[PDB]
Design a protein around this nucleic acid. Sequence first.
DNA 1: CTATGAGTGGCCCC
DNA 2: GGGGCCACTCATAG
RNA 3: CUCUCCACAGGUUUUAGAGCUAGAAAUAGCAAGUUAAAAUAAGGCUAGUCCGUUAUCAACUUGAAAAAGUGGCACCGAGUCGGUGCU
Length: 1134
Amino acid sequence: MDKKYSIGLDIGTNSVGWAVITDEYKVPSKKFKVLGNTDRHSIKKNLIGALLFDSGETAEATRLKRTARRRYTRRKNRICYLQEIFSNEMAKVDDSFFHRLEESFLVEEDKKHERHPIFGNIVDEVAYHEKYPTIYHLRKKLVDSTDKADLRLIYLALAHMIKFRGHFLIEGDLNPDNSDVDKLFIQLVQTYNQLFEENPINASGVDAKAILSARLSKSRRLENLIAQLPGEKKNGLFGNLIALSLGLTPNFKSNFDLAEDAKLQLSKDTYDDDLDNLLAQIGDQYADLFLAAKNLSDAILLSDILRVNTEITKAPLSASMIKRYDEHHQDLTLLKALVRQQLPEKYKEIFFDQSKNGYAGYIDGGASQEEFYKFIKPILEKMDGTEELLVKLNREDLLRKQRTFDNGSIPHQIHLGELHAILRRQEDFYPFLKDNREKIEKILTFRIPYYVGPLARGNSRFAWMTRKSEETITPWNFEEVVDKGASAQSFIERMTNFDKNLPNEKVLPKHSLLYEYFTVYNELTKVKYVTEGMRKPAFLSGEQKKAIVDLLFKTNRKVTVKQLKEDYFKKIECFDSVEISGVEDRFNASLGTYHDLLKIIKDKDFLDNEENEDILEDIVLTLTLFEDREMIEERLKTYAHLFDDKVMKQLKRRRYTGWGRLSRKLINGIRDKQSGKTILDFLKSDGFANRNFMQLIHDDSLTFKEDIQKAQVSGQGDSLHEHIANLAGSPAIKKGILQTVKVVDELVKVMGRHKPENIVIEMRQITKHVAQILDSRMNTKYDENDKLIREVKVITLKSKLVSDFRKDFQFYKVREINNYHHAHDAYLNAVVGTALIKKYDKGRDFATVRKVLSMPQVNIVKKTEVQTGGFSKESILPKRNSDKLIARKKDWDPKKYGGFDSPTVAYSVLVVAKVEKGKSKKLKSVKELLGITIMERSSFEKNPIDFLEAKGYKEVKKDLIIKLPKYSLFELENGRKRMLASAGELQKGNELALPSKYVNFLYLASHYEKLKGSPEDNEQKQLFVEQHKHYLDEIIEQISEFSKRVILADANLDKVLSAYNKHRDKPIREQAENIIHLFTLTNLGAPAAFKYFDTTIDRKRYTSTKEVLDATLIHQSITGLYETRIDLSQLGGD
DNA sequence: CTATGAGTGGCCCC
DNA sequence: GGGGCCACTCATAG
RNA sequence: CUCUCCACAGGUUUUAGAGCUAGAAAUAGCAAGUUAAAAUAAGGCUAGUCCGUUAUCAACUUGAAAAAGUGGCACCGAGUCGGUGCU
């Protein structure tokens, strides 16, 4: 008989539960054949289990690393270009100079030339370092001196500028006009006034440059600037913005009434993510305010760095850094004198001990500036004459280096100016500098446009550039080889996000005019008004909505309910008293783009004319797509006949960011067949119905739902490769879905290839997508009428049903005991789903469920994965006399140069061969696990025998090489199991099966004061907990027995037992909350540390893999029902 | 008598 | 989080 | 929610920046310290101002791979599954 059955599933991010049940909710048990060379021919297993795997990773880290690699390659290429230019003239001076520069890294033994790179003789090196203690002294010398200079020094300065050319955020020629502190402060005030028109700040008469750039501490400058603004507080939003500009860490919680703390700091690398999180909670209308704050911060940092402005010169940065060097020298001398005079004992700890956070650790060690200031602050306060030193420490200017993290704000125009000054002064003596000045300036300033991408000949999957010819792309002929227009067109066709509602179309910009109209009309659709004499609230009519928009939304950036009441209902419709529902204080929608374009173009008729909609949409799209001003001008050049020069100039400067959620074809592209109206047309006026956006797409009376269903293409989703990205979700859930489909395939295989009646899936639109994926792969029958035959029905259930089922019928869930709960959730999902389907014998069902939940044999499978990723840790360690350091190059011996350490093992291979041991070089047969690291994987797979022979293994048996990826399972005596974490470490592999009564007791005792139910039920549960306190002893006894049997952690187990007796009088709730922590000792996976009351139990690591070389290797399928057991003790025998 | 492997504790991770 | 590595002490064993 | 591009500032590593005096040496005292070069996943051939950390992967047979194929059923029970019966 064909047993009708269903497959229940519980898809997660790290686990994929699965279970097979019959019509009676019983999980069948079948006897499975076991292959391999062991005596166990057959094993009986229950058809229930769970699959565990590592979480999926997103491509963010790989993308960052790839971008970094490209940056490094292109910087190397710039230096190569400069050396190519200088190559001809350098040979006449010192031909080996470029070789000596390249070989500076090597030790004296590996150097082919003289060890001094610049001049090659020690006298000239000493003279150079005495005359130019830093590179900035040389830079100032070249900028200022008219005398003929040495060509090597010119190359050094030019290469130092080109290699560290600074940021590109400031756009266009010039710089001092954009760098005004006053200008950006005025812009910030204007932005704040625009966002907070009700509370304008009068910034007139405020000398922002004098206050913000003065030599005071950050808090003092903040307070001084606030004091000049009447009515303002240092705790206000503007005060917090100024503090953020000055480099402090203000809290925005009070200014936005947020639940959690909102602290931002521009110096932190995570500023972008925190700002995105803050904007997602406060709204994206404040992005311009934070951009203005960042710009003001950059201006402040530049004014702090380029202190020297009075003296007439053309290299301000060089003079500023020389000034910092002089200040550091003076303060160091003063500090040495004072410390020697007053604290002779601490002189060594400050100036000699590199392990401390003193000056010695600040310079020769790894101490940063913050740690150095922390270490030096208390010492100065204990000494006399340190007033000025304390002031500088409060200013963060004491003993300050030149190459610090502050230099991230210096524009590339300053470096370009210094480069131009050098090239102008020194070209009189060296003709090739004069002939190549433009080339060097281009090499410094040329930046590959972000819309051209990698410059590949097709052999890169990331490239979209189109080539006019086949010449090599250099900074000087980029424009002649690359077609910038075609590249931009390809970049638009590739980048733009596809709409989710209509997959083929492209979403509109978030600031698009049509999008703003759509939002305004959607919000106005559900507005109700109540006037005197009206029995029920009424919706706004189409003419009413149009009048409201024209009178308020086209005149005010933000419109509130009170404004509507006093401006439209009263002034226009003569309603003295009106009540409005659906909007509390203000409308979220706003015609911000409309107001900006009215400010720029200054033609309201042009904006309100529907004939001009396409032009405005294209202008907004062009502004949102691109950032380079050349493209912005080029694309807008088609509209030059419609606007004057000033309007076009103002349009060129306006920029937009972000994309919306809906496409133009969805809103105003598709039309209802019966009426011809779009979604926007119905939003403007729908008569008495007044349907909103969601209603329009779901109303069966309109063709919108049919068109959405037709345009959207039901695809394979996951389980078809290169088509998974078509689905929408995190990569981890995609991995879970793929594993789920594989599990379903193997389960159908096991049960005699009869497809299940039902497939209950549990994890919303992603669940539905999974549903049609499994439906498509399940049903393969087409009738003559083309209707699908529903042999398999996929049902999706909410987790709340299962939660109520657990809490109501005492099938309590405790996560910490073991990983059995995944399979149990899957089984309960299946039971509930089948019950509801049968709707559309309580005692027997309850007994069956309780019996199934108490089964100790559950097929937990840990998915074996061949590790990939970084070769080793990214820290470069100092040289050591150790053989575990990895060379960074082929010819860089780690004993001399240091290098990477801690490589990651891809997989281990069992090696049966003979190795020479001892000084006698005697051949001895050995059998061990050898770890094949990720770096060596390709070489191993290319020729395993040669790779093993290179490691000293001789007489290698090729047939006995066994591939053992991570989490390979070995079975040892008394059922003890260990999973291979790496070639030199193991993991726990056994699962504790507590009886259900202990699980219920622990669940009730842990939530003793947190039960959610009727008071009588809570009293009953408390009484039950108090009655069965002796279960604590039984739980401890079972933990001890299981540990002694399979864990073998005698020391830690004794510690736990001793601590248990110590706190036996503790409250029962605390005892349960602490015992639940004890199961970290027995949980599957890597050992972990845990706290039992006040006692911390350190983790027990299994650092020996010799014990598994004589155990039973188990190859488990994805479900674990099919397995092949290999007894390694029979391999390698004599 | 000294060279070799075996476990335990602690530090470390752009 | 969890695997790698080093220093110290212990067992081994020619 | 996901994917992609262009740049910046650091940081680490080795070398260069002549250490002096008293002392046979161990060592003690003193002087100095702020910068630069090179590398930043080993490398690869398709030789590009390209690619190299995402995704996928139990065992056996066919293959280069994609990919395909390989493992009887019913009942009574449960400490990681056991027993009984038919084929």
